Design a protein around this ligand. Sequence first.
Ligand SMILES: *[C@@H]1O[C@H](CO)[C@@H](O[C@@H]2O[C@H](CO)[C@@H](O[C@@H]3O[C@H](CO)[C@@H](O)[C@H](O)[C@@H]3O)[C@H](O)[C@H]2NC(C)=O)[C@H](O)[C@H]1NC(C)=O
Ligand SMILES: *[C@@H]1O[C@H](CO[C@@H]2O[C@@H](C)[C@@H](O)[C@@H](O)[C@@H]2O)[C@@H](O[C@@H]2O[C@H](CO)[C@@H](O)[C@H](O)[C@H]2NC(C)=O)[C@H](O)[C@H]1NC(C)=O
Ligand SMILES: *[C@@H]1O[C@H](CO[C@@H]2O[C@@H](C)[C@@H](O)[C@@H](O)[C@@H]2O)[C@@H](O[C@@H]2O[C@H](CO)[C@@H](O)[C@H](O)[C@H]2NC(C)=O)[C@H](O)[C@H]1NC(C)=O
Ligand SMILES: *[C@@H]1O[C@H](CO)[C@@H](O[C@@H]2O[C@H](CO)[C@@H](O)[C@H](O)[C@H]2NC(C)=O)[C@H](O)[C@H]1NC(C)=O
Ligand SMILES: *[C@@H]1O[C@H](CO)[C@@H](O[C@@H]2O[C@H](CO)[C@@H](O)[C@H](O)[C@H]2NC(C)=O)[C@H](O)[C@H]1NC(C)=O
Ligand SMILES: *[C@@H]1O[C@H](CO)[C@@H](O[C@@H]2O[C@H](CO)[C@@H](O)[C@H](O)[C@H]2NC(C)=O)[C@H](O)[C@H]1NC(C)=O
Ligand SMILES: *[C@@H]1O[C@H](CO)[C@@H](O)[C@H](O)[C@H]1NC(C)=O
Ligand SMILES: *[C@@H]1O[C@H](CO)[C@@H](O)[C@H](O)[C@H]1NC(C)=O
Lengths: 225, 225, 244, 244, 238, 238
Amino acid sequence: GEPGPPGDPGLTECDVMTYVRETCGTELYVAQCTQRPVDIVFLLDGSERLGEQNFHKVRRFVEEVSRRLTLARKDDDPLNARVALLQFGGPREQQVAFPLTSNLTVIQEALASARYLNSFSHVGTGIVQAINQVVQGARAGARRHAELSFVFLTDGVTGNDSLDEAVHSMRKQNVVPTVVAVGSDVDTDVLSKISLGDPAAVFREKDYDSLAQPGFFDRFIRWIC
Amino acid sequence: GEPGPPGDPGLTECDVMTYVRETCGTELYVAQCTQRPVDIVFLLDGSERLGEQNFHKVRRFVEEVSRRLTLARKDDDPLNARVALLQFGGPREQQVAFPLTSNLTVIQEALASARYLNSFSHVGTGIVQAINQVVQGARAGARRHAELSFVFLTDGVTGNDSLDEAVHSMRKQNVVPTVVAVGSDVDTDVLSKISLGDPAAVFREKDYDSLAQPGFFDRFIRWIC
Amino acid sequence: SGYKGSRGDSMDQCALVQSIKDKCPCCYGPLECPVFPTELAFALDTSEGVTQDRFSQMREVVLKILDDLTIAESNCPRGARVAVVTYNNEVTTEIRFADSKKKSVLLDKIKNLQVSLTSKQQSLETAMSFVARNTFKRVRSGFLMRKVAVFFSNKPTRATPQLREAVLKLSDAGITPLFLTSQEDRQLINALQINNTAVGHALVLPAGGDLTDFLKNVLTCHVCLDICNIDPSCGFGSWRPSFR
Amino acid sequence: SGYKGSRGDSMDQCALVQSIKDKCPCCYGPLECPVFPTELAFALDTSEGVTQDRFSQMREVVLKILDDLTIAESNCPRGARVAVVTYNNEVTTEIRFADSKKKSVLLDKIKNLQVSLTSKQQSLETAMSFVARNTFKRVRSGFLMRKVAVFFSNKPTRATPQLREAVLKLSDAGITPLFLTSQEDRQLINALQINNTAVGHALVLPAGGDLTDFLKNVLTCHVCLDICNIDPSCGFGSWRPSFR
Amino acid sequence: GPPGHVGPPGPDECEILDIIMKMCSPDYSCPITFSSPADITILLDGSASVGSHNFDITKRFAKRLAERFLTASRTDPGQDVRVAVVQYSGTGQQRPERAALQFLQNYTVLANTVDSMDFFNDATDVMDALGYVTRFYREASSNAAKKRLLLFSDGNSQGATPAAIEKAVQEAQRAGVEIFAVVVGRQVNEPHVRVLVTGKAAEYDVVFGERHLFRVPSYQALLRGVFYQTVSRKVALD
Amino acid sequence: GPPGHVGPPGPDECEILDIIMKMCSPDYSCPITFSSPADITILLDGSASVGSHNFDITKRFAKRLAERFLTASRTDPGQDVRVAVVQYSGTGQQRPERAALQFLQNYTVLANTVDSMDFFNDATDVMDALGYVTRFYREASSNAAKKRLLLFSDGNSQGATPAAIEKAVQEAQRAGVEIFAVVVGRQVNEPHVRVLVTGKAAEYDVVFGERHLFRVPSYQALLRGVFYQTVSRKVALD
Ligand SMILES: *[C@@H]1O[C@H](CO)[C@@H](O[C@@H]2O[C@H](CO)[C@@H](O[C@@H]3O[C@H](CO)[C@@H](O)[C@H](O)[C@@H]3O)[C@H](O)[C@H]2NC(C)=O)[C@H](O)[C@H]1NC(C)=O
Ligand SMILES: *[C@@H]1O[C@H](CO[C@@H]2O[C@@H](C)[C@@H](O)[C@@H](O)[C@@H]2O)[C@@H](O[C@@H]2O[C@H](CO)[C@@H](O)[C@H](O)[C@H]2NC(C)=O)[C@H](O)[C@H]1NC(C)=O
Ligand SMILES: *[C@@H]1O[C@H](CO[C@@H]2O[C@@H](C)[C@@H](O)[C@@H](O)[C@@H]2O)[C@@H](O[C@@H]2O[C@H](CO)[C@@H](O)[C@H](O)[C@H]2NC(C)=O)[C@H](O)[C@H]1NC(C)=O
Ligand SMILES: *[C@@H]1O[C@H](CO)[C@@H](O[C@@H]2O[C@H](CO)[C@@H](O)[C@H](O)[C@H]2NC(C)=O)[C@H](O)[C@H]1NC(C)=O
Ligand SMILES: *[C@@H]1O[C@H](CO)[C@@H](O[C@@H]2O[C@H](CO)[C@@H](O)[C@H](O)[C@H]2NC(C)=O)[C@H](O)[C@H]1NC(C)=O
Ligand SMILES: *[C@@H]1O[C@H](CO)[C@@H](O[C@@H]2O[C@H](CO)[C@@H](O)[C@H](O)[C@H]2NC(C)=O)[C@H](O)[C@H]1NC(C)=O
Ligand SMILES: *[C@@H]1O[C@H](CO)[C@@H](O)[C@H](O)[C@H]1NC(C)=O
Ligand SMILES: *[C@@H]1O[C@H](CO)[C@@H](O)[C@H](O)[C@H]1NC(C)=O
């Protein structure tokens, strides 16, 4: 075929602009995934504003994400990362799901029978129950320093009876928040509180179906690892 | 399958908008082609700024246009429209081309042997030569009132030694123009002069290749017919 | 899936204009014709035997009609656009829909318009077709656009299929012709109208004397007739508001 | 067609800033560290036997280091970001890269930070890995982004392969660590340095007495060393421009 | 498949009014006349599907609706113009007390109740809400008056099947009150809201359908413009 | 296919000066120094491919170039700094006559000639133009001076082949003048322009091409910004 097109400029205009701004005076650079010891526990609110079809789409997204990430063999601080999910709700004041575990078949089986609450859910009670459950699991799984990152898959608009206390407890519990809001309708206060004073620790997706968009999936997997 | 979607609202916001603007206080409505007696003569200036490959593209465009429009059998004021084209230049102060005729085989042969001038076009001399030639042809073809429309395939940037006199001759010769400029670089003066004081008698094409865009081709055939 | 559902209802064409009219300040006070923006196409005739004085009379008639009407100088869809042509066995455009931009310049052009004495014999059907398929090749947009053509004749038209076909084409084109000629012809009225459906009347003009009567008739209930409030008995017939 | 051409030449990272720096008014007058916006990560050790008075000493050291440095309160790529953590057999983040927004609030938080008296036995490798793969999990952008970590130890480190692997990972992460400990260990230097190419010095800290003698060195020479105008003979070794 | 149902008819008087008033520079606002005595009780959503700020904007819109209806010059001093407000939530959650709220001419109790209700944080429940509304009408409203009603809905509620809502709306019709549906957003079970509007799923009358349904894209858009004027005027017209 | 050649290097001093001055707010503008005496004769297009207005903006750019070069503080009063201007067109059209124009120092006469030249409306001929330039230098410029030249072109010319351009540029090189190419737009015969820039088609040097080529997308953008000063300073640097 024909010769390839000529190369781009050595230092484009934006390059020099960034240089000058840097000397005297967005996007954040994160080192790509390296299978570092990680432990992630999702959180999907049961509020009826989610949607049965949207619940199915979120199930698909979660299983795809679990497929993409490498899964550790076991515990006692090997390399690789684990995964957990729960679907707490308002009614019954409690709900449970599978604990952290890398055995993917358990994940598939639990997801298959996943029940969509379609009911109110106060985020504070959910998060405190989640942190209690994951603390219990971690204690059952030795020290495994690694980390503890929580991904909030929800708009977050819900009852805040004990939001602040749970946020404080999570803050003291060496956690790394991360939020993926869906839809234009979102309250900035809840996002800010969960983000722990970060402007770029939140992603936005116009529709729940976009969770299957390859671009957003790649960005999310890059951010988490 | 599933039922169709709901229909268009009653007097859509734009509908009432136009109604109110009309009551007290763009696009022009043209009756679709009805094969009324029309005589059309093209004009492709040989200015070196056209391009040999762009000349081939214009040849293809003219071929397509002459193919789509219906062609009359003969003269003496029958229905249907004819076609003509010429490629006048500046050097040698003249050029010749096939006259108005519906024998598409002659059009094919002329296009096949079509020579890209890569030369100049004192648009005034070219247009006066064209009007003389088409007047001679029309006289050879009886009255055939019909009409006489010219299509200008040129940016128009060129020497204007005798532009105004030829413009006046065109005015007196019951002519109707239609100009399709291509490229950002265009002079408003020449376009206005050849458009005969019209703001919507000019089409703008981003690039020569856009001449093959079905949308623009359909719009052009709709305007001319 | 099924195709798109049917277009819904509407508030009719006229009565909505009545409503918006009462409600838009200063637009129900001083009326100015045309009632709605419209195209007007004058077509003069130079057929042999046309007396120059009669040409002057028609020139005065057209000038008065223009002055009584405003124009749409800008691109705002409000006001009258004009197009003046001359016709014979052939046709020759003089001023088209685009050149005219100011009332004074249009009046000056029309007054200074060349008078072309000639001898070619009349053929009104050619002018009919010309206006049908050349002058109205492009017209300004507007949901309530009105289009009117005014013609001339120094001799009654013949009775042939070509003219009836031509007027059918005119009607199909949306025009609302108002012919003017010295004397009536029941055949002309019959050919113009169709199946008890009028296309456009054929008035009468004088060989000298008073003009304000018929001039008033045309200016009120023909050239700038409100599509909504048609006068009680201005012109015997049935009228035909809106497109045809 | 063939693939895209190669990247073009560059004016070199070092002296383009030299040029722009002699060129951006008032930016070549008063100096304020850090020379370029950078991340600084303090990690504190609560290892068994860490004397509380010594903890106060390190607290004052960190407080002074913070005061000497400015902060990037806004999102403009200019100023210092901070991250303070405590490490033991396990680790516990105290303040991350996000919460810090003002100098006074940061100073108050660090001064009011709880002292976690404990008895767990130390293992510096866990803290190395934590900082390598958790603290720097995300950092601010910038073509000349600079990263630095400061640590502590109330006991000399062991001589094990895992330490070499951890320091290799740190180097791969772009960090430029500056450890601090009571007493030297040639084995520590050897593990840090790679084939005679240093990765980070291991300075010394006092059990009392004067401090500024080494505070000046650390501040002028490691934390906010100029990228290109390096001090002639500060610290035995070979220095490093940035990255590895 | 079969073609879709006819789309909504054109702008009514009140939005053509504000569109003309926007630029054309004669009465304005959006006048109303209660031709015959009647009542209205705008029902407000309180399920989580709305949310805090959405619930608050709905409260504001309800307040505006009530004030506009009450201020509208009564067509007869010898008779009354009557409005009321109540909040519905999960089963058996409909403030105020049964005997508490009557038809009102003043604005004290109505305004305080409008600005004092609380979000409930429970799944949408339409059955008991509709039963409460219809029984309250049956017991309270005077026999002669021909009343009207409005409702926010999403067609979603636990333990909801089309036949049950068919029966409930049939009971409401037996009570003898026409109903109108106003909804916000598109995350709505279309068949259920269509049923609620019509009462006969098989025969969805186009005229009854389009007239009785108002659609809004977003909660914020509900308050913007003169939509409130249009809905109130449409409620007024018999 | 094979990969494309290396792209243009990073921006030089002048435009980085401009960008720092744009927002960062010491001598500025774009100082030049003619280290050693030389000559420059900016060659301006005269074929229709440019046009009337585009030819006018080219004339303005030429006038500015002459002003900036002449005003540049001569590095030595003992020797001179030399500039000239000519317009080329179809075969045998290079104003002024061969014996008229010398190296000019006062700016007014050169400026008057620049503002008085008329568009030729003759085909794009580059053979005779290059011959004119090279023979004029051969006859005129003093032996010691090592000169420089600019040239506008599109690489398109009737009766032109790569061999002819190569031979002409070789003759110019034998005359002993290095050449630089500045072009506008992209309706350009890339091989011919590259050959003119280098003269060694097969062994084209990427560094030579990138150093000796200037690309401007639009005629209007040519005068805009600091492009003129950047190119003039590049001409200045050895
Ligand atoms: C761990 O992952 C497995 C899938 O890899 C989960 O489901 C397991 O699926 C296999 C496939 O049929 C079942 O086969 C059984 O395996 C056992 C050995 O574990 C073997 O002794 C049986 O004869 C049979 O082949 C397996 O039963 C099934 N796991 C369980 C617990 O029933 C599994 O649920 C995941 N969690 C575990 C194993 O705790
Ligand atoms: C509610 O009504 C009271 C008084 O009732 C008025 O007379 C009724 C027959 C009927 O026509 C109501 O609509 C009238 O408003 C209004 O003002 C109260 O007046 C009494 C009389 O002294 C006084 O004691 C109260 O404090 C007044 N209420 C106040 C000050 O809030 C009252 O304005 C009406 N509601 C609103 C919202 O204004
Ligand atoms: C154009 O040149 C003339 C005279 O040249 C001057 O002397 C040369 C040696 C060289 O140094 C040029 O740069 C000088 O400008 C300038 O105008 C003339 O000036 C003289 C002295 O005042 C006067 O007698 C003449 O009448 C002037 N000629 C005129 C008015 O036509 C002129 O300034 C130069 N143009 C510039 C500098 O743009
Ligand atoms: C929960 O959060 C809200 C706001 O984030 C707190 O206050 C509410 O603020 C919104 C702002 O739009 C108002 O509309 C509400 O009216 C406020 N609450 C009330 C009761 O009026 C609220 O205090 C927090 N906690 C609780 C228990 O609601
Ligand atoms: C006119 O059209 C015809 C076809 O409609 C063209 O084709 C030639 O027609 C003549 C008529 O007898 C034949 O003898 C030739 O053999 C046809 N050409 C070929 C290639 O078969 C004709 O060429 C057109 N007129 C002209 C002048 O070319
Ligand atoms: C018509 O011809 C005249 C000269 O015969 C042209 O006049 C020039 O127009 C350009 C347009 O910007 C001006 O910049 C020049 O200053 C004018 N004069 C000269 C001497 O160039 C005119 O441009 C031509 N019209 C066109 C090309 O549309
Ligand atoms: C008959 O009269 C009607 C009445 O307007 C008209 O629309 C129609 O075109 C006429 N011709 C035919 C064939 O119906
Ligand atoms: C060897 O030194 C080079 C040069 O600094 C360095 O890049 C590399 O990582 C070193 N490798 C080892 C094994 O020391």
